[PDB]
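Regression check, NAP case 1859:
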Amino acid sequence: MFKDKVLLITGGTGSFGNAVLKRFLETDIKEIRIFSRDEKKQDDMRKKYHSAKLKFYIGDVRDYNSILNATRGVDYIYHAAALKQVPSCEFHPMEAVKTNVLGTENVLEAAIQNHVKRVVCLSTDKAVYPINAMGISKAMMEKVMVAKSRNLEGLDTVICGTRYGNVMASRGSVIPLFVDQIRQGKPLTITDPNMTRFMMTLEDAVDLVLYAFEHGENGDIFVQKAPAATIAVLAEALKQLLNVEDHPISIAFEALLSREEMVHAFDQGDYFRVPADEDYNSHNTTRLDVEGMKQLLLKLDFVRALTRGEYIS
Amino acid sequence: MFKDKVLLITGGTGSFGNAVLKRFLETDIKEIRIFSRDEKKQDDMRKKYHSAKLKFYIGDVRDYNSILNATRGVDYIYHAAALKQVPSCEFHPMEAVKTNVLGTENVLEAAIQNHVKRVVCLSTDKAVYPINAMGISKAMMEKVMVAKSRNLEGLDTVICGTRYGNVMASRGSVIPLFVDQIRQGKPLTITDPNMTRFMMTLEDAVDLVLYAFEHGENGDIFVQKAPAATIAVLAEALKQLLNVEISIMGTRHGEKAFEALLSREEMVHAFDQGDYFRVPADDYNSHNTTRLDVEGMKQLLLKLDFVRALTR
Amino acid sequence: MFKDKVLLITGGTGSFGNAVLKRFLETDIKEIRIFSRDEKKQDDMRKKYHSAKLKFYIGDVRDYNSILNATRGVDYIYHAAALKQVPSCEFHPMEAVKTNVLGTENVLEAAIQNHVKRVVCLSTDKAVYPINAMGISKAMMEKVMVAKSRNLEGLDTVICGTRYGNVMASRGSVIPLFVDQIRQGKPLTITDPNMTRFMMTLEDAVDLVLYAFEHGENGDIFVQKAPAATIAVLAEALKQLLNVEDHPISIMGTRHGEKAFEALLSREEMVHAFDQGDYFRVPADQDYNSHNTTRLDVEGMKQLLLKLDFVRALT
Amino acid sequence: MFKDKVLLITGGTGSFGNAVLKRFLETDIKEIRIFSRDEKKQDDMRKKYHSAKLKFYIGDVRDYNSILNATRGVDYIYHAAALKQVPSCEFHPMEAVKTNVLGTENVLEAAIQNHVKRVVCLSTDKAVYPINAMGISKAMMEKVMVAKSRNLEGLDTVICGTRYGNVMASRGSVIPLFVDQIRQGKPLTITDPNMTRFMMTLEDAVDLVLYAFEHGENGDIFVQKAPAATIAVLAEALKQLLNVEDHPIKAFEALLSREEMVHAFDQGDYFRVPADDYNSHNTTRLDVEGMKQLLLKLDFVRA
Amino acid sequence: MFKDKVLLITGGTGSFGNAVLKRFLETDIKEIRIFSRDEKKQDDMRKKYHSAKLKFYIGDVRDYNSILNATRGVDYIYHAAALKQVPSCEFHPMEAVKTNVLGTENVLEAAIQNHVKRVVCLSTDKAVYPINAMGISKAMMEKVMVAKSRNLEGLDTVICGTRYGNVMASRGSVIPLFVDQIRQGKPLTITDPNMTRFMMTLEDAVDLVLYAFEHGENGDIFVQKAPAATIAVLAEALKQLLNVEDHPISIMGTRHGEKAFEALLSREEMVHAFDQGDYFRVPADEDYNSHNTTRLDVEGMKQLLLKLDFVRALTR
Amino acid sequence: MFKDKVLLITGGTGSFGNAVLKRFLETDIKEIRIFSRDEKKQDDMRKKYHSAKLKFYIGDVRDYNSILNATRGVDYIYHAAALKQVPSCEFHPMEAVKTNVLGTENVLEAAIQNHVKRVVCLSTDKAVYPINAMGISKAMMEKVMVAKSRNLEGLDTVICGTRYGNVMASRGSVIPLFVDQIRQGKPLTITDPNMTRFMMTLEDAVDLVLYAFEHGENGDIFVQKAPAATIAVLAEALKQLLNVEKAFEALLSREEMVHAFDQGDYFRVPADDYNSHNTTRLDVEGMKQLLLKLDFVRAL
Ligand SMILES: NC(=O)c1ccc[n+]([C@@H]2O[C@H](COP(=O)([O-])OP(=O)(O)OC[C@H]3O[C@@H](n4cnc5c(N)ncnc54)[C@H](OP(=O)(O)O)[C@@H]3O)[C@@H](O)[C@H]2O)c1
Ligand SMILES: NC(=O)c1ccc[n+]([C@@H]2O[C@H](COP(=O)([O-])OP(=O)(O)OC[C@H]3O[C@@H](n4cnc5c(N)ncnc54)[C@H](OP(=O)(O)O)[C@@H]3O)[C@@H](O)[C@H]2O)c1
Ligand SMILES: NC(=O)c1ccc[n+]([C@@H]2O[C@H](COP(=O)([O-])OP(=O)(O)OC[C@H]3O[C@@H](n4cnc5c(N)ncnc54)[C@H](OP(=O)(O)O)[C@@H]3O)[C@@H](O)[C@H]2O)c1
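Current build output:
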């Protein structure tokens, strides 16, 4: 679907943006535009990929004119620019509002003005039953995206969103913490052995975005079905992959869709599709055993490498 | 404490603003300013109170210059301007952000610039564990109020907030609607019989706002303790008072089954101050508070004049 | 001409907006959008009409983005959002400028951007020979609308306006004040018995807007011809309909800022206006008042009063 | 009253601003700031006056920040920046609103923020019974000025206004047209000989602004009493002064409305309209002799 | 190329705008819109040309809505609105930025929204190697114009620029000063006799704009090749044409902030420039200045001066 | 002059900002506020320094309200927020204008409104005889800083600036490239052997800012005198140390050099030629002593 087309990714210097580049840079796509504020991160990527298809635009989604110019001639937009950290959003909620909410309004308005064909907005499980300023701002962003998706019937723009939770082995998460502790001979620090988390990789997320991109109608929100595991099972599976069963250990659920969303949702195989108008959480989804957890971990390249005595990040 | 002071109420044409006028207009306060957008409502209100202490300002809290201008020479502000209806905010969430969040940032910034001494912001229980755009926007508003309340260490401005739920015998609430349905001989329309609500009056909310006004520290949020009841117990108690011993519809979209005034997180830091909790800046809900039975519910209803009028 | 079309009324929760719904809602129009600021009023309207064709948009004409979003996919706009009260505007003239003038520029620019086919702007007789801030701002609005309409030759947007004065039995006007005073046994309070007003119903106003809507060219202002009456003759006609011919009347005296006649077209306008039967058309450049129009006697005034259901019920 | 004070004139490059400069530059005022958009006019003016007391600010009254910055440390403001031509305003009424109404709002807000002591706003007779966009916009400007002047009780700022009509020997006005037509041997172009205009000089206008400046209270509008003449009387007196007798050849201006006249204070040479009919037809009529004596106040005519 | 078309000139009340009007007003062009802030200058022009083709718009290029509105139905735009005086920009550099940079951005965005076919932006030699706030701001404008000229591939708008220095017999310049001083028998005031300037008439500038208008691709900057001369040679050629070969000259000294040459293309630009006959074309990605271009001798300088109607008149 | 004061650094997450913290965090200063846009960098710094004196503000200098808010209660500001990369500014000159010029206008205007006492602005040698969008934008910023510094006589705010070039062993500079190229076994990639650069460390840069902070008058720009070296002498001295045996920058224009005050180790350009070819040239021995000021170099 990307042949001779132009894709723009807001927040493209982030982990998502990189995942998308690695998949698409050497395909038949014409151009990938990276839109973000930071010139150092953009320079590093330029050198890392050394690809003529990769165009970099300095800009801020808070700035309508900026995004309006970057989206001239663009076919598709992946909207991933956000403030995503909990403490900074707690202390500067206006900043979260300006970026996540007003920023989102700008990209969509620019997309509509420039006749962009498709826009996918990335959202988080923290938006379902939100408890802090970051989560709240993402919940508000969804509401905004859905309202904006109305009246585009004559026009040729489809806007929809995807929602996913934390991905395995992202920065400062449990898996790289456990791996380090095992490498350093330290006991694993475990809060609650029975705390459950959804388990999905960064590749799975890219697939979720690709699915929404192909199948979405205005205002749709897609969620990918994901299995879950307890921290107990995660630690056990990891000690077995790294050959340290005889290794010391020292001693609550996330939701992807609310009850309300569940009653209206379409089950579409590996995805739920929530059309615009029990909970689905890590406790009641498919539970992984150690063997199934080991298969998921082995989808991480740094972990495959460890079982060979190789070390990469 | 209001003697010869100037009070400005944003959203002053609403039910809150009226309750505040009825209490304070004929006391020793120098001036009450009503700041809102609607010329019709202001005109009606002006005729109703016909008081020289009552000054009217047309303006929108979305307009910084406008609120900056009206708060020149003001000592205290009750910030009550909001979009508060659920369906309206769901279909227009940007309007809720512009009014509830950005509008609040404007009022607070104007207050700081004009050396206003105290501001109390009104919030709702729907901001706790919010599930709809209205509640989400109010939750965001609380965070902004709190964040703005820091760095005022040099300045002589105090900002705090209050949070309360639905009041009994309000314009479009359950009690006058049930009475109205009976007057028309129709069965009572109930969404969820097992739904609990805090039972509280407009008078109590004014007390709550006055309480925060006297005692608040920067970033404080006050909540008033109240008993609760199911709509079932409420409907039953009202039928007994009216001597006429129901249609169950469904739980409506974006409507919880209980109201929450403090989250689990807040409950941990909150100070219990007798009839109020005080949440300082940086679980308590209608399900686990004092539950009223038909007898307890009746003794409350008989304190409401709108009900007294009907039993007499 | 409205079949399967989308109409948006800015200021749609007002009396004009309601008259338009009562006429068009149950016709073959596709959708009517109401655009205004107050959620309370919109909610009442929604319950009142209970129609799937009626869509509500919260927004302010001061906000370009807001009206730009509400007019996407719209065919026609009736622009009726205004601040119209005289005392309120004298103390806050910037608010009048912001809503009446800048708000009008916003709706028109949005209309041009969303390729809306026709926009009719509602104006008032107070724009003719204006003496106060409300009136001054409405005069400026007409000029802004007219200037905006001289830019559209490449585009498929037509912009024009209508001008009319108060409608009979509007809120806080003379007729319901008299009816009330009669019901409560009080003498009728009259300021100046010889004061004349144009006599015109709310249905007549909808017809005027429809006329402009059908026949308007860029920058036109349309005015509907109407008879007038003194308050004396109005009071007499009403007392007879209510069978209270000998009911006292109190001559209070002339109010601050209340004229004795209204003008619908100025002398300068009459020189250029085209007589088109029941309407005048003032073309854009690129005296007609209540004293000298057709004067009604009591019998004529009674036939007009009987057009109001509010009065019919009383007989 | 200007001793060691700072005066800012918006629209200072105009004919009024130059009249004020000619008057005040060589007094004990500390500084006169000229605030306007045109670098050309400001440069010529700098060269013409070659004075260290004369400071120039490029800026637009539509730009709040610009005027906020230019008025830091200013004691007094004469607000004279406006769009004034009638045809220009009919075709671009938004520019008139932006400059005359919103621009004025900015100057007053800037003056209030910077604690400027006095602001006098210049207005026109075309604002009384306005019939066109230029006049309507000036009428709006007065209402805005008056409304802003309420709430200054805590503050030490006084805002008021002046209103006057066309001045004699201004550019493209009646006198230089008649002078030019005689120079070119052409007959005098008269629309209506029986139409009356107030007769007043540029120096008189400067006096009017100084009067309001000294005596004004919040929201006051001052008007200067002036005699009037028919264009007929004007042509004759002018033909006689130039020794070219027997040479081939609204309808009045109003300075106070009926409503204002009821509330106005007669203060000798001035009316003072306090915040809440006088026209050229019914004011003192000049005959040919009185017109000649006025025309001789123009040095331009003496030659 | 102007038949039945609509042309808009920002800054149309200035000297360039007049030269374009004198040239095109009485041709088959449909309409010329003059867009500027000053009602006085516009009224003067209106009377001067008395042409039904000449339409006036009040507005500021700093105001996006104003220019958006003025360019509806416009085919071509000559963008000549600027703040161009050196002292003025030094004390208010923000005003230079607001008008020259943000104003240019507004005009270009308006042109794109209204589907204007071509825009030519006028720039100055002071943008090459800029040393003061006026020049610095004009350099920024070119960068902004070039950057905006990208991504218009789908759209049917072309944006390009021209750069030129002072033209002969413009206001407050050397020639009308010398001509006046001669008529009053006063000696000619010369700062630095060896200072070289490019020699180029107002008509040449119009041709340069017309050329850029016909030939430009997005982001192009055109420069017209021009010979140069010293003030010494300028004074001598003029003294001979006016028949005052024996006319006193006062050497004041080199003036503050006045260079001895102007540059039209930098070394870096010359490396990338295309030679197109009478013009250089710098595409969007030796120094070329008045010292190293063709020197005019007195005789060749006479032939240039004789192109001015103002000078031809005096030899009669 | 820092005792119990509040310092705010715009762009505080940069290499300069980190240098200032390393120096001042554990002194008797009351508070250091870091104002920048990036939550990731701010978080890492919070973790790295773990100090209660270090406050973080998310904000953009393009946003007047944001900077107005973070400067409430601030005594001194180091304005170091900029876009400084050349290609990036060539393709996006409006972003350079918005951040470097309008952003600077916002900081000073907020500084004035909140009665900040002293503001020092950081500028670059590329503002002298500028040739590309980044440099042009910085030159404009100086003009804006200087113009803003007039009219402050009544107010208790002083604004001034500093200008310096690339510092030794900065990211993507000549030195770490040479070290890395030996590390990857390739001979060193040299553009022009004869090209001169001023030779200066990050610590010297902090001193320059401290100097301006102590001595600045309204509209002043300070430059620190520094020696220079050929790329040859730079390359040669390092190869001896490592045991493996345009073309100049300008700091003051001819125009500035005429009015500049010589103040010992600094030039002070008051409001209204000095380059790397004609400054003190280091030989291999002098270059050796300078390279040894880098801990990055000492360690090897
Ligand atoms: N593990 C996950 O990846 C995860 C989990 C749950 C939800 N999500 C959601 O998926 C989205 C993508 O997440 P991510 O992991 O890729 O986050 P990320 O790594 O932090 O990337 C965010 C990027 O957004 C850019 N950005 C921030 N503010 C901007 C602005 N005002 N204008 C333009 N660009 C701006 C930043 O680039 P610059 O600093 O260069 O400007 C930043 O690199 C997020 O919105 C997130 O809520 C992700
Ligand atoms: N059950 C309850 O009533 C309840 C419960 C908990 C908390 N609260 C909170 O108490 C506050 C007010 O209570 P309420 O019952 O009196 O609400 P209300 O009756 O709806 O009155 C709100 C007022 O705000 C004004 N307003 C809305 N938008 C504005 C704007 N953009 N600028 C200026 N004024 C604006 C409206 O007046 P105009 O239309 O004239 O502009 C309206 O009169 C609300 O913030 C609400 O969240 C209410
Ligand atoms: N060799 C040199 O690098 C050199 C030499 C002389 C002078 N200077 C000047 O000194 C400063 C550079 O210092 P530096 O190199 O140590 O830091 P830096 O690495 O260049 O980073 C500067 C910081 O500015 C922040 N920033 C960028 N745009 C911003 C904005 N719009 N609002 C708020 N913050 C913003 C960035 O932080 P976030 O991404 O977190 O927002 C960035 O970390 C610049 O002014 C530079 O021109 C540099």
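Comparison notes: The CA atoms of residues 87 and 134 of chain D lie 8 Å apart. Chain D is about 40% helix and 20% strand. No diff flagged against the previous build.
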